[PDB]
Ligand binder design. Structure first.
Ligand SMILES: CC(=O)N[C@H]1[C@H]([C@H](O)[C@H](O)CO)O[C@@](OCCn2cc(CN(Cc3cn(CCO[C@]4(C(=O)O)C[C@H](O)[C@@H](NC(C)=O)[C@H]([C@H](O)[C@H](O)CO)O4)nn3)Cc3cn(CCO[C@]4(C(=O)O)C[C@H](O)[C@@H](NC(C)=O)[C@H]([C@H](O)[C@H](O)CO)O4)nn3)nn2)(C(=O)O)C[C@@H]1O
Ligand SMILES: [Cl-]
Ligand SMILES: [Mg+2]
Ligand SMILES: [Mg+2]
Ligand SMILES: [Mg+2]
Ligand SMILES: [Zn+2]
Ligand SMILES: [Zn+2]
Ligand SMILES: [Zn+2]
Ligand SMILES: [Zn+2]
Ligand SMILES: [Zn+2]
Ligand SMILES: [Zn+2]
Ligand SMILES: [Zn+2]
Lengths: 186, 186, 182
């Protein structure tokens, strides 16, 4: 059956995301609608390019990057997002429904909770911080900062900024999972 | 909506909470019922009075404060709570249903999991800890400690204690969001 | 919709000796994701009172839940089967469940051990606090489907790095989620 309460990337490892080069990563993102809140589960695997293997010995200034999901007024993912549109859809089993969705407003971050930009200092409640671990190692933390509706050129957005303090020496950027939630638009 | 699965403060910024003076803050709290667990999402904006701008040079020992939600046997908010009664109801759209609810036991913290204070041994599982960030700045952590059913003068309670260890100088007390869950009474 | 240990404090888990602990675990199915809430009370034995001045090398322990093709708990799990069932009130359904595959950790998200690249996404880390004291953290590492001799697994490793002196191992609560098998 069509799982109309889940919007996801599918849980496979095929690259679906472009951070620095085309399809250099798998963002695994599952949004499950529990009424007024979306329960969100996220991880990242970088498979190629600039962020695949971190070396802060050779490149000490490379300490963060950003993955943006931008949505229009109907909750449809915009082309300029880092996440590709071909496997972002409602769930069917371990895959997606066949028809590209036309409406997902119920999965969008609430605009009264998280107003869009701006020319307006905004309240911090539109941010959630967490920590994930590279390679599952407990001494390899990175910060995942999630921000709602702070991108311009869209109606809604979810942004993930990944950052770290440690001087990583050939560490592959693939992460443990993090769960959060946010208030839904409808 | 008439969303009988969500009890909330609404997502607006109208001050609804009294910490040190009348309506000096907006507590944004959303309780969403996923069967036997309540999914909770919380943030705080202090808009005026003593806790609005922290200055620990002027006030070295102001390092914490508490917001309490106290409930009767039917799950109805009691007026000694810091959150105002007019701001707390079942969801309708971005607003509240027009008349106060009579029962919300399904939203109350489970008394077997989290007993009221008594002569019996108190267990730590009635607490959840998280860290939120003032102004969304990653060097401005504060701890949110949430405690279930540990107030007297009520049948159920949810208490939020906000505290910090750093010496903050002119830092605005408005927070990022935190998600947690707890076991429901019914 | 809810698989759980019941929320009472009667011991149901064997870490170092028979029924030395109460694992309170609640798994609620929100569709494609399981919402999980976990805490631990150790009541007796080696892990009840931590004293790292006396015993410097007692710094971690593991609790394993092993499941077969049907989502049924295998009896070599640390958690006892008598206690683990679908909710009815504050107790359990009268009969033992035959099926809960919809509560199992998804095997494409979280594959069993293999001879291919092993990804970290099958781990969730959190911190809980012993005695509810903010200066007594311990790490709770949760891992999906990485045990052998089972179809599915959930494992909780508890560890700490501070030198605790006479600290009772009873934790605050931690919530996490994971992608469901179906
Ligand atoms: C409830 C609660 O929160 N309790 C905490 C209490 C409590 O606040 C007080 O007791 C009051 O009640 O405090 C604990 O800490 C006591 C204080 N303490 C002692 C130490 C040793 N060092 C020192 C240190 C300090 N800094 C400051 C920079 O840090 C921040 C900041 O700017 O303030 C913290 C922010 O949260 C962070 N922001 C974000 C968004 O993340 C920022 C940010 O990153 C930067 O600003 C950049 O923008 O930074 N730095 N050092 C702290 C310390 C401890 N270690 C041990 C080794 O570290 C790790 C590791 O990397 O290996 C961390 C890792 O996450 C962890 N892994 C896991 C899975 O948990 C591992 C692991 O435990 C071991 O490796 C074993 O495998 O350890 N290094 N440096 N710091 N603070 C307390 O009382 O114990 C903590 C308690 O939770
Ligand atoms: Cl009022
Ligand atoms: Mg909705
Ligand atoms: Mg102490
Ligand atoms: Mg299912
Ligand atoms: Zn790689
Ligand atoms: Zn297009
Ligand atoms: Zn290491
Ligand atoms: Zn302000
Ligand atoms: Zn001001
Ligand atoms: Zn600063
Ligand atoms: Zn004890």
């Amino acid at each position: 059956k069509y799982d109309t309460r889940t919007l996801w990337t599918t849980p496979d490892t095929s690259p679906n995301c472009t951070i620095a080069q085309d399809k250099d990563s798998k963002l695994t993102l599952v949004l499950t609608k529990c009424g007024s809140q979306i329960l969100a589960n996220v991880s990242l695997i970088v498979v190629a390019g600039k962020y695949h293997i971190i070396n802060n010995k050779t490149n000490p200034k490379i300490k963060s990057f950003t993955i943006k999901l931008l949505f229009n007024k109907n909750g449809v993912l915009l082309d300029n997002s880092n996440l590709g549109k071909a496997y972002w859809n409602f769930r069917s089993g371990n895959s997606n429904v066949s028809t590209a969705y036309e409406k997902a407003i119920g999965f969008m971050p609430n605009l009264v909770a998280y107003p869009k930009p701006s020319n307006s200092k905004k309240y911090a409640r539109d941010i959630v911080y967490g920590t994930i671990y590279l390679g599952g190692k407990p001494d390899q933390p990175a910060v995942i900062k999630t921000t709602f509706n702070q991108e311009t050129g869209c109606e809604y957005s979810i942004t993930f900024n990944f950052s770290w303090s440690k001087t990583y020496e050939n560490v592959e950027f693939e992460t443990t999972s993090f769960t959060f939630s946010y208030i839904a638009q409808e």
